[PDB]
RNA sequence: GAGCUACCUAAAAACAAUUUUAUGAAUCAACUCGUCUAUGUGGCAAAAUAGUGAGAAGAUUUUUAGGUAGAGGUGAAAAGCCU
């Protein structure tokens, strides 16, 4: 009976879970694109989004600095969070991270894998799933339906 | 008025940079020893080949 | 508790060939438009993704040389330029990573 | 491959048409629902008077939550909130074709999406002219109380002072041991017990050399249909169609429940003073107040209760 | 702008409509009876009608030690010692038989829960029954009483020294040796305060409610 | 919630409940079909090598809202006939004793303070 | 066959801190032992683990080499130990 609980049980315990997640978050901020097991990447996605919000609060905020200090073990990253990532995501209200499933791991444990990144990074674009064009057969028929309904009141 | 933490390596991590910081921690004890005997004792107490 | 009787191959064949124990056939396998290799509908193409990361490793390798050591991450945005490209006015005051190869067609 | 492939509604939709389809489906839901607002003007089936031994149709409601309620005597009653959402009569079976003793009506509530449903269910609703509903339940209704399919049902069907029966699936607790499932005592924690603390004791006696059918054993608990009998109705909110029911109702919040007049012998014939087929807002002989109260209930905004 | 705690919805999967229905009843009662602003640690006098008696009310004075409950079910507990006997009553704010709620002394305390006053000396829980209300100043902040009470011998109702309770209003030095404070910190769970998914932001929710309450007025 | 072997406080002016013989009286029996004793429930008391009836007038266990939760388990000694052993009670007594089923008027006459 | 174990011979070793009438004294490590409980029961182990406990300057513990052999040896006698 684990109804309503919003966390995975990871690592050696609750504290170990935080540290495992913290290490992934630290890697994500530095490199902006990280591969982990799909479950662990999903666990860390929420923290990645909330960290940007703390960065938006501002450099001078004391709580933001303490939060940034705890989560970014490599302390050179803290300037990056407040002066690079937060300015980038000023317009958005959320959805800063992009997470997609990668083919399973070829390492005899066949782990389910994911790629987690921050949006807007400098790295080569991921091969995202592109929806079909309006020129396809089904789309054109729907486009015809849309035009008639809009034009005819 | 932003108090960024200093950009230094971890004290406890298993890395080369972290170990070097632990080296400086031990060496500071020598710098802070008033007597010449303590400085020699600290500098020579650990035996290796 | 220990077995009272040997289990016959007739019983055993019913256990290990029951449909519940068989490998399910997958209906979500599709062919990738760009590379022409196989993929699952909900999963990224492994061939195309393989191209992206290996280019990423090349970029990150160049980054490591420029920084030269740990704890040297910039406080300004980064940008990657390939041979035959020069920083624009908007590119001013941003770390530039230089790659010997030409700009990949897919990378823009 | 010349083989079967899996598809979903969004697979071949472009970004532009992806939003268009959602608006198109949402628009149709509104049109169909409005078309059914006026039943009396749509060839209603003949209206019959109430007579002893009659059974009306029931409703399907969503379980909102609980709150405290006070009566003019100062006693506090925990009450559960039941909201009727898109309750409509869907299908009618005559007395002969369902059960010789009584007729049946199928009533559905809680409009749901049309995208991940079997075509058979979608075909059923298309003829009926309604959007699909999450749950169907069957109500035994006497012939005089039969209602035409497609007729909207509202919370004002019930009235305060009326006792009612609620049935829903209980909260699912998964596989459980005998201590939690059947209230077994277990075994002592200390004094030498070797790996026996929450276990069943002896299954049966040795003489019969077997285990009796129905023996209480560890297994999956909850997620079963259960009924609560004789819950009073304290108040009804006409604007939002909320029924206030005494006590607890099986299931979790946001779960659909089946509500019908109580079958207890004491409340044998309560339909005498209730809308006999159902309550029709279309008639609007007198527009109902926003909130209907039971006499004992102490309404908010009343003066403080002094036991004078 | 002081928003009463009960109005804040707790996180969960409940529909927001359930809260709108409850708020309408809550605000309607507040029109009939005025519920004053108060915090844990403030002294309150509550007048309630006794069902046992006939048209005869009762008054209880005590320090508020806990606030709990949301919606129409909100409650508060206030404590006092009467002829040397400690008594606590848990009061439902919206119970129809509460005639009046009077904030004899409005003040705030270092901790938002004062259940440790059961283990503190009797003086810290005794309050004069007939004490008259003290004046309050609108153009001020609520006074934050920083009293740190003295505890009685170590056997306590709870292990208040333990980090989970997070007690900041007890003189632990007088009652506990430095080793015992060290031994307590083994329960510290330091990571709790720094994990961002355990924090419920009610700023926007509190904001939207404020105008809604004011708008109805 | 008074049980068997619970230590209780004699809130009365009776001789048997005085502080001499510090050993607190202990409950031998609860006169309920359940063995749990709440406010208004009689109990049998082991006091000074004697067996005496007592009536629970307060206890530390949380009850229903709007009712007083005390800091000690209080009792009043009751004679076999039912007359209270002591003639005065000074500690507050909950008013709920009035309505609940039983014979409690005699005790309420003895107690000045109600809370 | 005494590289285990029992006892002995020779040559060696270890014992912090804290108190004490100055020691087969006290508190308690290292070290030696193995009280009680749970686990384990083809186990990590053909006797262990985890806690909890006993002694801990002595009739103490430990190392190296030698000695006593079955009608026997050794034994602060458990008819215990001698691969
Ligand atoms: Mg879950
Ligand atoms: Mg209740
Ligand atoms: Mg479950
Ligand atoms: Mg038990
Ligand atoms: Mg056990
Ligand atoms: Mg048989
Ligand atoms: Mg306790
Ligand atoms: Mg030897
Ligand atoms: Mg020594
Ligand atoms: Mg000694
Ligand atoms: Mg000892
Ligand atoms: Mg000793
Ligand atoms: Mg010996
Ligand atoms: Mg013998
Ligand atoms: Mg013998
Ligand atoms: Zn591809």
From Swiss-Prot, chain A:
Single GO molecular function: structural constituent of ribosome
An example Gene Ontology CC term for this record: mitochondrion
One Pfam family hit: Ribosomal_L17
Annotated signal peptide: none
Keyword annotations of the record: Mitochondrion, Ribonucleoprotein, Ribosomal protein, Transit peptide
Subcellular location: Mitochondrion
GO biological process: one example: mitochondrial genome maintenance
Subunit structure: Component of the mitochondrial ribosome large subunit (39S) which comprises a 16S rRNA and about 50 distinct proteins.
Family: Belongs to the bacterial ribosomal protein bL17 family.
UniProt xrefs under PANTHER family: LARGE RIBOSOMAL SUBUNIT PROTEIN BL17M, RIBOSOMAL PROTEIN L17
Record-given protein name: Large ribosomal subunit protein bL17m
Protein species of origin: Mus musculus
Lineage: Eukaryota, Metazoa, Chordata, Craniata, Vertebrata
From Swiss-Prot, chain B:
Gene symbol of the encoding locus: Mrps30
Subunit structure comment from the entry: Component of the mitochondrial ribosome small subunit (28S) which comprises a 12S rRNA and about 30 distinct proteins.
Lineage: Eukaryota, Metazoa, Chordata, Craniata, Vertebrata
Top-rank taxon: Eukaryota
Name by which UniProt lists this protein: Large ribosomal subunit protein mL65
Similarity comment: family membership: Belongs to the mitochondrion-specific ribosomal protein mL65 family.
From-to range in the entire protein, with total length: 41 to 89 of 442
Subcellular location: Mitochondrion
Curated annotation (Swiss-Prot), chain D:
One Pfam family recorded for the sequence: Ribosomal_L3
Superkingdom, natural source: Eukaryota
SUPFAM superfamilies the UniProt entry points to: Translation proteins
Subcellular location as annotated: Mitochondrion
InterPro entries in UniProt: Ribosomal_uL3, Ribosomal_uL3_bac/org-type, Ribosomal_uL3_CS, Transl_B-barrel_sf
Keyword Ribonucleoprotein among record annotations: yes
A GO cellular component annotation in the UniProt record: mitochondrion
Alphabetic keyword roster: Mitochondrion, Ribonucleoprotein, Ribosomal protein, Transit peptide
Family: Belongs to the universal ribosomal protein uL3 family.
Protein's name in the database: Large ribosomal subunit protein uL3m
Species, as recorded: Mus musculus
UniProtKB/Swiss-Prot annotation, chain F:
Transmembrane segments: none
Protein name: Large ribosomal subunit protein uL14m
Family membership noted in the UniProt record: Belongs to the universal ribosomal protein uL14 family.
Gene: Mrpl14
Record function comment: May form part of 2 intersubunit bridges in the assembled ribosome. Upon binding to MALSU1, intersubunit bridge formation is blocked, preventing ribosome formation and repressing translation.
GO biological process terms on file: mitochondrial translation
Subunit structure and binding partners: Component of the mitochondrial ribosome large subunit (39S) which comprises a 16S rRNA and about 50 distinct proteins. Interacts with MALSU1.
A GO cellular-component term linked to this record: mitochondrion
Location in or out of the cell: Mitochondrion
Residues annotated as signal peptide: none
GO MF annotation terms: structural constituent of ribosome
